[PDB]
Design an enzyme around this catalytic site. Sequence first.
Site, PDB file in Angstrom:
ATOM      1  N   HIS B  41       0.629  -1.285   0.150  1.00 35.22           N
ATOM      2  CA  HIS B  41      -0.175  -0.028  -0.130  1.00 35.22           C
ATOM      3  C   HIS B  41       0.819   1.307  -0.143  1.00 35.22           C
ATOM      4  O   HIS B  41       0.258   2.495   0.104  1.00 35.22           O
ATOM      5  CB  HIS B  41      -1.118   0.148   1.200  1.00 35.22           C
ATOM      6  CG  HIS B  41      -0.653   0.196   2.400  1.00 35.22           C
ATOM      7  ND1 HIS B  41      -0.134   1.371   3.042  1.00 35.22           N
ATOM      8  CD2 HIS B  41      -0.554  -0.834   3.368  1.00 35.22           C
ATOM      9  CE1 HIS B  41       0.246   0.764   4.416  1.00 35.22           C
ATOM     10  NE2 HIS B  41      -0.127  -0.308   4.567  1.00 35.22           N
ATOM     11  N   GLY B 143       2.669   6.011  10.379  1.00 32.43           N
ATOM     12  CA  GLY B 143       4.131   5.831   9.989  1.00 32.43           C
ATOM     13  C   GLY B 143       4.690   4.486  10.463  1.00 32.43           C
ATOM     14  O   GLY B 143       5.719   4.160  10.031  1.00 32.43           O
ATOM     15  N   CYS B 145       3.641   1.458   9.697  1.00 32.72           N
ATOM     16  CA  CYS B 145       3.591   0.311   8.574  1.00 32.72           C
ATOM     17  C   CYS B 145       4.898   0.095   8.199  1.00 32.72           C
ATOM     18  O   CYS B 145       5.869   0.669   8.024  1.00 32.72           O
ATOM     19  CB  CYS B 145       2.469   0.910   7.415  1.00 32.72           C
ATOM     20  SG  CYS B 145       0.954   1.470   8.015  1.00 32.72           S
TER      21      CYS B 145
HETATM   22  C1  LIG Z   1      -9.455   8.136   8.260  1.00 24.61           C
HETATM   23  C2  LIG Z   1      -8.818   8.274   6.690  1.00 24.61           C
HETATM   24  C3  LIG Z   1      -9.053   9.384   6.095  1.00 24.61           C
HETATM   25  N1  LIG Z   1      -7.270   7.991   6.900  1.00 24.61           N
HETATM   26  C4  LIG Z   1      -6.532   9.207   7.395  1.00 24.61           C
HETATM   27  C5  LIG Z   1      -5.058   9.081   7.188  1.00 24.61           C
HETATM   28  O1  LIG Z   1      -4.574   7.822   7.815  1.00 24.61           O
HETATM   29  C6  LIG Z   1      -5.413   6.587   7.190  1.00 24.61           C
HETATM   30  C7  LIG Z   1      -4.812   5.257   7.921  1.00 24.61           C
HETATM   31  O2  LIG Z   1      -5.380   4.789   8.913  1.00 24.61           O
HETATM   32  N2  LIG Z   1      -3.662   4.808   6.981  1.00 24.61           N
HETATM   33  C8  LIG Z   1      -3.268   3.349   7.140  1.00 24.61           C
HETATM   34  C9  LIG Z   1      -1.927   3.280   6.654  1.00 24.61           C
HETATM   35  C10 LIG Z   1      -3.236   2.785   8.933  1.00 24.61           C
HETATM   36  O3  LIG Z   1      -4.374   2.516   9.106  1.00 24.61           O
HETATM   37  N3  LIG Z   1      -2.283   2.613   9.348  1.00 24.61           N
HETATM   38  C11 LIG Z   1      -1.822   2.841  10.646  1.00 24.61           C
HETATM   39  C12 LIG Z   1      -1.016   1.711  11.225  1.00 24.61           C
HETATM   40  N4  LIG Z   1      -0.822   1.478  12.637  1.00 24.61           N
HETATM   41  C13 LIG Z   1      -1.547   2.408  13.572  1.00 24.61           C
HETATM   42  C14 LIG Z   1      -2.075   3.517  13.212  1.00 24.61           C
HETATM   43  C15 LIG Z   1      -2.735   4.603  14.080  1.00 24.61           C
HETATM   44  C16 LIG Z   1      -3.393   5.304  13.656  1.00 24.61           C
HETATM   45  C17 LIG Z   1      -3.265   5.759  12.246  1.00 24.61           C
HETATM   46  C18 LIG Z   1      -3.089   4.765  11.109  1.00 24.61           C
HETATM   47  C19 LIG Z   1      -2.428   3.647  11.581  1.00 24.61           C
HETATM   48  C20 LIG Z   1      -4.116   2.436   6.342  1.00 24.61           C
HETATM   49  C21 LIG Z   1      -5.484   2.934   6.016  1.00 24.61           C
HETATM   50  C22 LIG Z   1      -6.149   2.152   5.202  1.00 24.61           C
HETATM   51  C23 LIG Z   1      -5.866   0.894   4.790  1.00 24.61           C
HETATM   52 CL1  LIG Z   1      -6.781  -0.299   3.939  1.00 24.61          CL
HETATM   53  C24 LIG Z   1      -4.542   0.385   5.101  1.00 24.61           C
HETATM   54 CL2  LIG Z   1      -3.841  -1.070   4.557  1.00 24.61          CL
HETATM   55  C25 LIG Z   1      -3.578   1.157   6.051  1.00 24.61           C
HETATM   56  C26 LIG Z   1      -6.833   6.722   7.263  1.00 24.61           C
END
Ligand SMILES: CC(C)N1CCO[C@@H](C(=O)N[C@@](C)(C(=O)Nc2cncc3ccccc23)c2ccc(Cl)c(Cl)c2)C1
Lengths: 296, 301
Positions: B41, B143, B145
């Site tokens: 991703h 960050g 990931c």
């Molecule tokens: C709400 C939306 C507009 N956005 C805002 C910007 O950040 C987006 C987000 O969450 N990104 C990641 C990289 C994610 O979830 N990674 C993370 C990994 N570990 C802990 C996390 C703690 C807090 C935040 C992200 C974390 C993500 C999102 C969707 C997918 Cl399908 C995947 Cl594979 C990965 C969601």
Amino acid sequence: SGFRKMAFPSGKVEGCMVQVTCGTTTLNGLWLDDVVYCPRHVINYEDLLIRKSNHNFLVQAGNVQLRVIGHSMQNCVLKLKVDTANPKTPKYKFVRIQPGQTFSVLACYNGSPSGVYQCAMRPNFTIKGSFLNGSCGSVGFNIDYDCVSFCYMHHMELPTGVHAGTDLEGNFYGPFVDRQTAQAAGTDTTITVNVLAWLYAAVINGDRWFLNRFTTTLNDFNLVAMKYNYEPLTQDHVDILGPLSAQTGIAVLDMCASLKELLQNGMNGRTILGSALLEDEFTPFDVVRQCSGVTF
Amino acid sequence: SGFRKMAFPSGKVEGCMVQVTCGTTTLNGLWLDDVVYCPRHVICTSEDMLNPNYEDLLIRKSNHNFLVQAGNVQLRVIGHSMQNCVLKLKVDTANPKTPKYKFVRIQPGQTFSVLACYNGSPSGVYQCAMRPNFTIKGSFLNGSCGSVGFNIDYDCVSFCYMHHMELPTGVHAGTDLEGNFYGPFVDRQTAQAAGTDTTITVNVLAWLYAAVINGDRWFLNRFTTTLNDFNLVAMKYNYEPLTQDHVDILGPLSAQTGIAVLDMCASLKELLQNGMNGRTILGSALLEDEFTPFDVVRQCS
Ligand SMILES: CC(C)N1CCO[C@@H](C(=O)N[C@@](C)(C(=O)Nc2cncc3ccccc23)c2ccc(Cl)c(Cl)c2)C1
């Protein structure tokens, strides 16, 4: 999201662990520059030390034997001068920590690191560690930027199962001696500023059930805290909790009224950050670091 | 004496952490030999995440679009391929700090250490378990990931997990190092929820044996149970079924303490019925399930 007991990355310390053998005793040493630091009980200590010669100390760094070219004692730590400077020596300092402060422990057996855990210097100066025979000389540290601050060296296990050790200058934490005698850990208390920091970490993680509309005076909180064997909360602790109070919008004395209610009434079948007990081994700085992502 | 949640020394993994940047996205990569492994991703935008066509997005990328940074040294990407949900970036320099390693896929209940990283810089190490619902209760911020889960056995690092996402409940989902997700999770921003989680029964039993080895016997009782009667009770407390494999795995601890597995099962049944009554077991007021039988033997002996 998530709150774990997190240790510092142990890599900079792993490159310093050596095995020190003297006679029938084998324990761990910390090889920094051309000196190996280890508990002096590996050998009146100055009287026993005088009888020793350099070649009596076998130092092993992985599969390489280091040659000892000098030896001196500083308090309860033996300093073995070696011919080779450790090329893996990181930027470091020897620091003495206060009770309530936390640090990472790289548990070692035969100069080989086997595990890393996080723990706190208890108010009774012991550490609730995880050690077996051969773990002596295992060290406690914190990492600030690129600098490793060595704060603890394991020396012994007390009869209750808790551990006692020194800073890297050989001064024991607590009223202990490195000798065969009756020694007991004093009654332990809960690190209040740490529990409050952990309650703020719980709020940051979305756990608000324990919050209430009430506030308390610092004195009334201390009168209650003293009843539950909680350390007194000072104005310094209140100041240190300032950033977390600003981030969550819950004043320190407001969180104190929450803590007071938890002490008097319990958790009522509820948990806080997956725990049924109030956790006191996260400092205010650990909470900020883990709920901000500072790297090393 | 003492029982701590212990992580493996992270040194061998720290020397493998790199930062991978693709467009506006920056995350962590694992640099082993001349390959950098990271979540696929990293090629996505937040919009692309609803329904990404990874092959379509990857075919549009060229080597120079991926900026890889190992400390203060930029690595040159000379090739790229995708294996399931992991991107493999071929680089022109082999990591001189590459340890002896293997890629292992673990089962639920297994534990491992997580080296949490941000911008290719390790910030912390913690121990955790693959939950029966295939999520991990980690501690990750944006960050993180590409942060990896591992075990170390005889100087060899077994990489078992790579962090990919956080689910709405705060738990984490990811893949093995071959890019296969643990659980029914997809690297898509679609309605995904972790299934109901259960307690890892074999792990709680192992932890009860660790407590007995450490001198804590208060919870033991004169009862034994059948494996089936224990499972009927365990199900009611959202505990995983205990299989004959689990009973066999607990054999060494049963032999060391002299308490038969079904005897310890009866103590667990009683603990589930009564609670702890203000007491603790190994400094805990809850039954711990993130220590495997193998972790108990490694730590207590
Ligand atoms: C709400 C939306 C507009 N956005 C805002 C910007 O950040 C987006 C987000 O969450 N990104 C990641 C990289 C994610 O979830 N990674 C993370 C990994 N570990 C802990 C996390 C703690 C807090 C935040 C992200 C974390 C993500 C999102 C969707 C997918 Cl399908 C995947 Cl594979 C990965 C969601």
